[PDB]
Amino acid sequence: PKEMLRAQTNVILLNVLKQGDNYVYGIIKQVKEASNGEMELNEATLYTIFKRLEKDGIISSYWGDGRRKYYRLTEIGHENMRLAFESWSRVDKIIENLEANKKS
Amino acid sequence: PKEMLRAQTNVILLNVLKQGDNYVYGIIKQVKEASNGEMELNEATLYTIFKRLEKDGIISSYWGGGRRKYYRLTEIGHENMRLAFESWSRVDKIIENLEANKKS
Ligand SMILES: COc1cccc2c1C(=O)c1c(O)c3c(c(O)c1C2=O)C[C@@](O)(C(C)=O)C[C@@H]3O[C@H]1C[C@H](N)[C@H](O)[C@H](C)O1
């Protein structure tokens, strides 16, 4: 489900930045390690995805020394991630009740 | 965030059918109870989603002391749920390794 890799990739990316600001080569690098080599994200997509988020104010960009472009999570970024994790937590619960309410 | 509520609703409906075949009013009830009244789905929304899923072969329908239309998860349905649940566990792990690679 190609809309789902979109989300999965977005989730992982968001988590990398919540760790701390980072640049694309560093981001692809960290992800490939944490996935023990199974996931190589492509620049075009990271550059592609990163445009949407800054467009929506979830992340912002800044140049740091040696000079590479760095990306950081904004507050609306931190907030929207919190709402995401919490809503999805309620979903976990709804589903768990369904399973439990099943056995009864 | 309406792209995420739609995604969440699809998970729940799919997980209801994974519990067992059911009709629309039956589904709304089970969801209302598992969410202690927080997620009250209306008919129209389920018909909308079920039309898409049936078109994509994820679910099918058949007739069941009153006559009800029942919906069922197809064989392809279960398989996508396994691939989905699995791809999503892989993501969880990746994120733990990112956090692990952080401290380490
Ligand atoms: C931090 O959580 C998130 C934060 C932002 C976006 C997301 C998620 C998220 O957790 C998430 C998912 O867990 C799943 C999906 C998803 O899109 C997201 C996000 O977008 C896709 C999925 O909806 C399917 C089958 O289509 C199910 C899958 O849930 C997993 C875990 C569920 N609790 C449940 O067990 C389900 C069966 O598989």
Author numbering:
A (entry chain B): 5 to 69, 74 to 112
B (entry chain A): 5 to 68, 73 to 112
The authors write:
LmrR is a transcriptional repressor regulating the expression of the multidrug ABC transporter LmrCD. In the apo state, LmrR shows high affinity for the promotor region of LmrRCD. This affinity is reduced upon binding of a drug at its drug-binding site, enabling expression of the multidrug transporter. LmrR is a homodimeric protein with the drug binding site at the dimer interface.19 Central in this binding site are two Trp residues, W96 and W96′ (residue 96 from the other monomer), oriented face-to-face at 7 Å from each other.
